[PDB]
Amino acid sequence: TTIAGVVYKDGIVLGADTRATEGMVVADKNCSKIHFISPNIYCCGAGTAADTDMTTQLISSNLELHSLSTGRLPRVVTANRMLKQMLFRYQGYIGAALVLGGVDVTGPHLYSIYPHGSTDKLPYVTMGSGSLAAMAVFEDKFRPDMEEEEAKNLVSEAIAAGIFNDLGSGSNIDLCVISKNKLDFLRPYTVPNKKGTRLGRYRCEKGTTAVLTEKITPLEI
Amino acid sequence: GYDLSASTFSPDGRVFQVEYAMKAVENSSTAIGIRCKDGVVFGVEKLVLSKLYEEGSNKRLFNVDRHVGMAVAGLLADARSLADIAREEASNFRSNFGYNIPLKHLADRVAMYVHAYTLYSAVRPFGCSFMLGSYSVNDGAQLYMIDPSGVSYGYWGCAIGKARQAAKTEIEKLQMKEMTCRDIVKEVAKIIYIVHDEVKDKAFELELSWVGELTNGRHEIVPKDIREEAEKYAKESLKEEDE
Amino acid sequence: GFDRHITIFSPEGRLYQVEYAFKAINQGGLTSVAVRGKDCAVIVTQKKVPDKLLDSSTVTHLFKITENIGCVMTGMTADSRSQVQRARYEAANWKYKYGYEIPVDMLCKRIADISQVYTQNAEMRPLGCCMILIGIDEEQGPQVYKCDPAGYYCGFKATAAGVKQTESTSFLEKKVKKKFDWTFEQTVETAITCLSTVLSIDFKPSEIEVGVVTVENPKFRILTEAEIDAHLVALAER
Amino acid sequence: YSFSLTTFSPSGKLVQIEYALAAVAGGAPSVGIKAANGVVLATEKKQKSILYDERSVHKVEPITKHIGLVYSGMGPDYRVLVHRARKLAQQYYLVYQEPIPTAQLVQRVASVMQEYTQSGGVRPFGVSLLICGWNEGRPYLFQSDPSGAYFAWKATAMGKNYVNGKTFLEKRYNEDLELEDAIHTAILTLKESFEGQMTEDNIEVGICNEAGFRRLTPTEVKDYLAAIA
Amino acid sequence: AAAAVVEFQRAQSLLSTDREASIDILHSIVKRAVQVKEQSILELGSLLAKTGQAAELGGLLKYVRPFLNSISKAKAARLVRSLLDLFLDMEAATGQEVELCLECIEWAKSEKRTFLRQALEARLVSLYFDTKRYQEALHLGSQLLRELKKMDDKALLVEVQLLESKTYHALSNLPKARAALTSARTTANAIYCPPKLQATLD
Amino acid sequence: TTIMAVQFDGGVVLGADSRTTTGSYIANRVTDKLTPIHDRIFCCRSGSAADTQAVADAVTYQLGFHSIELNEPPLVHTAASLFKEMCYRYREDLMAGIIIAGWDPQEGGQVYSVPMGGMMVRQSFAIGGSGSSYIYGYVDATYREGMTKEECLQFTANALALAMERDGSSGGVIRLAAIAESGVERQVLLGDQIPKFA
Amino acid sequence: SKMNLSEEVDLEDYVARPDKISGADINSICQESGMLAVRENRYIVLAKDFEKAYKTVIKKDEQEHEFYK
């Protein structure tokens, strides 16, 4: 896994790679690692895929109920508090390395929540297996108050570094750019590696494994 | 709206069982508490119902904490229950936060307990009203009164029981804010003796106490010599009034 | 059958015990008025101390739910204190759970829901107190809300509770018909003169409590005797 | 208490539920009309003075991005029921990552009302609900009753003059209506019983179509009122 | 936005001083945000109503209709009715009234509005009667009566039956005008009949 | 982690390094170890970041509610007592040392050190964290009664700089915070304002 | 019509109110407005007079609890 996020001038940009490895084999190639917490809040997930998915889903539902009650746009502080408190309740056993990021009334915010519940409110964060390479890229070429396109390119470069220099990292790069007005969900942003371009067709003939039984059932429409 | 439960409002919006608890409160003998400038002095007109009891056999003055003492009036069983509740509140406060409970906070907590009991019909309001008194160097001398409805109000001089109005007039005839505890003790004894109704109750004992700077913010029963001097002052005052 | 407990619906609706809770609120004996200006929210309340033995510093119906939210309570004082403690607990829990100060509307919604539970269940009684919350919302400005023992929590531009609730509401209605854009002094004066006119009393600085929240200073402040006297003297001079 | 306060009368009727129905019928008028491409829930939001800020307590509340809900009866009971409906919708979404069907939401809110009719120390909800929804590609209008019974309606009215509103809807309603026309019909039905000039603020309306349920702003309600005057 | 407001008060000042300049500025605004355009259309329509000019305001209808319906407010029936009523309280017998009303009715049919369509058809039969096209008035009125009988409101019904009564009084003598008037009176007896309608009946 | 809190007449000054390592990798380079509790009380956290943050939030909630109830500013001793109750009750669950320090009107200028285990003891100056040891002797040598405001600031900066420079698990910037009558004033020594030795 | 009102009255605002008041009540409102005018020694009744008279006469406002609706 390789998730990252960075806060630029007008908002934030999150970026995840796309791969899920069940063990040491590529189980998925297009796993969506960026989860919808709120119209203005998205959370990249790493670690146990089901655990992150269900944690983000539960907090998204809680925040939807909270927003319906309040009549106001939810806040990244609320999202971070919910995530951290629940992850602390489950004694780090709810393994979900999260990069939460949103744009509420009080500007853009980006937190990095760890499985044990510890949180960090940093301008740029990276988590997952490729976190080291992504943070290398960020520490290498990050400056405060970036613009939309350069922040997009920075996060793309970081996630690409993770993908290439880390095993078990994604194939494509997904981004989510959140501002006071727009919520672009670029999926995929790029495809650094597409496929090996298989050679000519090598299929067998029409009919090569006969059957022991046949039970065609013409079910009604 | 009947008056058989605290969960029922009268057609007038008046919970009647709380008023009946107050009616039970204004049947005990009397209890005054005067907040001097450097302490609080409690006095109780402890009616010795029979000569068979020992002096101090029905103590209506309890030490809720090192620095807090309460004087109760009404049902002694309910008063003892509330004293135990206040004692455990003070102990819990000290154990959790690490310092002596402020009297205002303790009074608020106990009053909210009394309100918890006056809310529902599964229980009944406490049939006793009490006064809390404390002195601290950093918070002055504080006196509060809490009634069956759970109404905690601070006072400079308060009276509960039968002759609360008479005790209130006698207390109003004082410059409490500028006196010292050593003299407010004599004044309290005088007030107890004045408000006492000899022909109606006859037998009578005076139970005093104070918490002040002279006690280092600690609630204690009045020493025997001081109590005797105050009682003599009250007797001579009554004699002079008669003459 | 039973207008003795809430959960009966006397046979046209008419929750009689809730109506009796409102009657208790009136029976409390005091009156409170709340107004909101362009940038300020003010709550005045009559202050009665008929003993000279009472501390007169503990006789207060103005409470601080949190540093930025104040309230004035009317009706039974024990129930008022209980609901104030509940409001403080709810505000603190909201801050701990969501990470930002509870809005006044949400706080009144919480207490109104609790009162609704009291009216829904038969074991309890609807505690007879009226709460008026004051605060500065980050976007809606000086929010002023009022919760009642039935669970109603409508937000108001200017409201009142107590024995003279109707007359205070009528006076504030007349005032808000015209030029409701009130400065801080204008709104404080409006509240004070509303209470004075309704009670037919010339207010000394002693027998009133004033609580204020302003956008510039969004901290619930209980004005001191000196400030109340300054406002009253200005009112008398004008 | 644990003993039910809603019991059968010697005539085999639940007088407690009947009295809850009376409380509902004494509530503010509300109308729900399902058009060919959406639904409209209108309601009377008349305050007792201009002091009442008619922007804090909303008479029509959304429960999901495709379900809205208005009521007639007790405001606090409506509040608790809308909160419970929101929680039920969120639970349904969490279990099945799919917005709760309107039929299921009304079924579960009706079950809540029924269990408050049956339970021991409680009172039947003094509100009747008018859920509207756009699950699938069809509009749904459901009325849930204090008894816990839910009826699917082409168009209905509940409140003070609900019988008159229902007669008016029968006369004026056709299956071929379109959302902007059903809004006209709903506001006209409310006017049929409204006592006074119908301002854009003392009334509230919420539509529900493919885009999802949304409470029309006072500006849009003003435009509709001007077109209907 | 700020420029729009500034030119709005400029148009108000020119309304106060010399209305023509304000009207020209309003046309400039319309040619030139959706709220600004619709508002300015409203004021300039009112100004043309006051000044008595009809061809310009009809051209305004022709121009706006497409943009009016497309830009926003599918409830643009507001503006359509407003401008038609501006015409039709500024009655001038310019001939273009019938075409404008038919165009608006067809637009309402396209939008699927029904009460707007029926109100426009009622006042269209009024226009046909006022322009002496009695046969067309009678046919449209009969269709509108058949619609409004099944969609019971009784008010536009009474108005349409009164218009049919007047048309028959003008054309087919009074064995049919009397019957139409009787129908109008009977229908009116079952509703309040606001003072205008009651006076028209009487 | 390196944290210090030293007392002076009329207030206190807290200081902390800004490093947070998940092993040999710095998860956070600019961590904010200092955490305000109510208005003047601050806690320097050390050990498990999750446990420290959770206990800090819980104590903040408890102390805010307590201060609202009392209508008075909370005592530094009261805040330290809350921290000590929580830590001592959940010793085995929590791995978190803390340094409470602040000012209150009653006995202003207080520093309590609640190490892991949950024992509350007042001190003139308190040290904590992984890098504590490397400077604890130095601070014992260099401390003297009567420190003034700026001299305490310099002492804290020097001690934290030494701990950061000699400790692998400590580094980054030095965040200082002086609390007194006027209030709390924060500051950061980034790269050169950090004192250097040799 | 029998009284002499100032041209600023605009009785429509009073008519369009949600009060169940009889013709006797309307006569009382007008009569009290005239009485206030006489009190202030004026022979023309003002909107002030009508406002005060209406508030003095139609004082039925009481109860109507808001939670029933």
User: Per-domain residue ranges for chain C?
Assistant: 1-238
Tokens of B68: 């807090």
Chain D positions in Cβ-Cβ contact with residue E147 (cut-off 8 Å): none
Please choose, from the candidates A45, A28, A26, the residue with its C-alpha nearest in 3D space to the C-alpha of residue A37: A45
Q: Name the residue range of residue B165's domain.
A: 1-237
Q: Do the chains contact at A69 and C99, CB–CB below 8 Å?
A: no
Chain C positions in Cβ-Cβ contact with residue A80 (cut-off 8 Å): 99
**What is the rounded CA–CA span in Å between residue F166 and residue F136?**
12
Q: What is the resolution of this structure in A?
A: 2.9
Total number of domains constituting chain B:
1
**What is the rounded CA–CA span in Å between residue F5 and residue E179?**
103
Closest CB to E81: pick one of D180, D224, D227. D227
**Residue that the structure tokens 């029963």 belong to:** B221
CATH assignment of the domain containing B188: 3.60.20.10
Residues in chain B: 243
Residue pair D46/D197 in contact by the 8 Å Cβ criterion: no
Q: How far is CA F192 from CA A36, F157, F182, F185, F188, in A?
A: 43, 12, 28, 20, 11
- DSSP of D63-131, one letter per residue? EETTEEE-EEE-HHHHHHHHHHHHHHHHHHHHHSSSPPPHHHHHHHHHHHHHHHHHSSS----SEEE--
Tokens of E64: 């706006």
Total number of domains constituting chain A:
1
Residue pair B222/B185 in contact by the 8 Å Cβ criterion: yes
Residues of chain F whose beta carbon is less than 8 angstroms from a beta carbon of chain C are 57-58, 60-61, 64-65, 68-69, 71
Rg of chain D's alpha carbons, rounded to an integer?
A: 17
Chains that touch F (3 or more CB pairs under 8 A): A, B, C
Q: How far is CA F68 from CA B42, B102, B138, C106, F107, in A?
A: 30, 14, 19, 19, 20
CATH assignment of the domain containing F32: 3.60.20.10
Q: Distance, in angstroms, between C166 CA and closest chain G CA?
A: 7
Q: Do the chains contact at C96 and F60, CB–CB below 8 Å?
A: yes
Residue pair F20/F172 in contact by the 8 Å Cβ criterion: no
Q: Do the chains contact at G66 and D195, CB–CB below 8 Å?
A: no
Strands (DSSP E) contained in chain C are 31-36, 40-46, 62-66, 69-75, 129-137, 141-147, 158-162, 208-214, 221-222
CB neighbourhood size of A212 (10 A): 4
**What is the rounded CA–CA span in Å between residue C171 and residue F198?**
78
Q: Do the chains contact at D75 and G16, CB–CB below 8 Å?
A: no
In chain D, count H helices and then E strands: 6, 12
Q: Where would I find the H helices in chain F?
A: 49-70, 76-89, 132-142, 149-166
Beta carbons within 8 Å of A155's beta carbon, 6+ residues apart: A4, A5, A6, A13, A14, A15, A175
Residue pair F80/F62 in contact by the 8 Å Cβ criterion: no
Domain C1-238 sits in CATH 3.60.20.10: yes
**What is the rounded CA–CA span in Å between residue D111 and residue E158?**
49
- Asked whether residue A202 is assigned to any structural domain, the reply reads no
Q: How far is CA D145 from CA B65, D131, D150, E142, in A?
A: 57, 11, 6, 44
Are chains A and C touching, using the cut-off of 8 Å on CB pairs and a minimum of 3 such pairs?
Answer: yes
Q: How far is CA C132 from CA C87, C145, C215, D47, E161, in A?
A: 11, 6, 19, 18, 58
Residues in chain A: 221
Chain A positions in Cβ-Cβ contact with residue F25 (cut-off 8 Å): 132
Count A/D contacts: CB-CB distance under 8 Å: 18
Strand partners, B53: none
Q: Name the residue range of residue A121's domain.
A: 2-190
Q: Do the chains contact at C151 and G67, CB–CB below 8 Å?
A: yes
Q: Do the chains contact at D22 and C152, CB–CB below 8 Å?
A: no
Q: Do the chains contact at C64 and F68, CB–CB below 8 Å?
A: yes
Q: Do the chains contact at C85 and B112, CB–CB below 8 Å?
A: yes
Chains that touch A (3 or more CB pairs under 8 A): C, D, F
- Asked whether residue A177 is assigned to any structural domain, the reply reads yes
Q: Do the chains contact at C93 and F61, CB–CB below 8 Å?
A: yes
* Stretch 109-168 of chain C: residues touching chain A, C-beta under 8 Å: 109, 138-139
Characterize F120-159 residue by residue with b for buried, 16 or more Cβ atoms within 10 angstroms of its Cβ, and e for exposed. Answer: beeeebbbbbbbbebbeebbeeeeeeebeeeebbebbbbb
- Asked whether residue B242 is assigned to any structural domain, the reply reads no
CATH assignment of the domain containing D35: 3.60.20.10
Chains that touch B (3 or more CB pairs under 8 A): C, F
Mutate to test the interface with C, among D53, D122, D147, D160 (most CBs of C within 10 A): D53
Interaxial angle between packed helices E55-71 and E96-111, expressed in degrees from 0 to 180 and rounded to the nearest 10: 10
Experimental method: cryo-EM
Chain B positions in Cβ-Cβ contact with residue C30 (cut-off 8 Å): none
D204 alpha carbon, distance to own chain's centre:
12
**What is the rounded CA–CA span in Å between residue B134 and residue F29?**
52
Beta carbons within 8 Å of F6's beta carbon, 6+ residues apart: F12, F13, F111, F124, F125, F126, F143, F147, F152, F155, F156
For residue F88, what is the nearest residue in chain B, using CA coordinates? Answer: B96
Please choose, from the candidates D17, D52, D58, D3, the residue with its C-alpha nearest in 3D space to the C-alpha of residue D205: D58
Residues of chain C whose beta carbon is less than 8 angstroms from a beta carbon of chain G are 13-15, 18-19, 22, 148, 150-152, 154, 166, 170
Q: Do the chains contact at G68 and D74, CB–CB below 8 Å?
A: yes
Closest CB to B105: pick one of F70, F80, F85. F70
Total number of domains constituting chain D:
1
Closest CB to A65: pick one of D61, D87, D97. D87
Active site amino acids of F = 1
CATH assignment of the domain containing A162: 3.60.20.10
Closest CB to D86: pick one of A58, A68, A71. A68
Q: B2 in contact with F at a CB cutoff of 8 Å? A: no
- Asked whether residue A185 is assigned to any structural domain, the reply reads yes
**What is the rounded CA–CA span in Å between residue E27 and residue E44?**
8
At C233, which helix (H) or strand (E)?
Answer: helix C225-237
Active site amino acids of A = 1
* Stretch 162-201 of chain D: residues touching chain E, C-beta under 8 Å: 171-172, 174, 177-178, 180-181, 184
Please choose, from the candidates D156, D145, D135, the residue with its C-alpha nearest in 3D space to the C-alpha of residue D67: D135
Q: D87 in contact with A at a CB cutoff of 8 Å? A: yes
Q: Name the residue range of residue F150's domain.
A: 1-198
* Stretch 18-57 of chain B: residues touching chain F, C-beta under 8 Å: none
Q: What long-range pairs does F139-147 form, CB within 8 A, spacing at least 24?
A: F139/F4, F143/F6, F146/F9, F147/F6, F147/F7, F147/F8
* Stretch 52-91 of chain E: residues touching chain D, C-beta under 8 Å: 73-75, 77-78, 81
Q: Do the chains contact at D5 and C7, CB–CB below 8 Å?
A: yes
Residue A96 main-chain phi, psi, to 5 deg: -150, 95
Are chains C and F touching, using the cut-off of 8 Å on CB pairs and a minimum of 3 such pairs?
Answer: yes
Q: G61 in contact with C at a CB cutoff of 8 Å? A: yes
Q: F76 in contact with B at a CB cutoff of 8 Å? A: no
Q: How far is CA B148 from CA B163, C81, D15, in A?
A: 18, 14, 38
Q: Distance, in angstroms, between G68 CA and closest chain D CA?
A: 5
Q: Do the chains contact at F71 and C85, CB–CB below 8 Å?
A: no
Tokens of F189: 């020594």
**What is the rounded CA–CA span in Å between residue E137 and residue E191?**
25
Chain C positions in Cβ-Cβ contact with residue D80 (cut-off 8 Å): 113, 116-117, 120
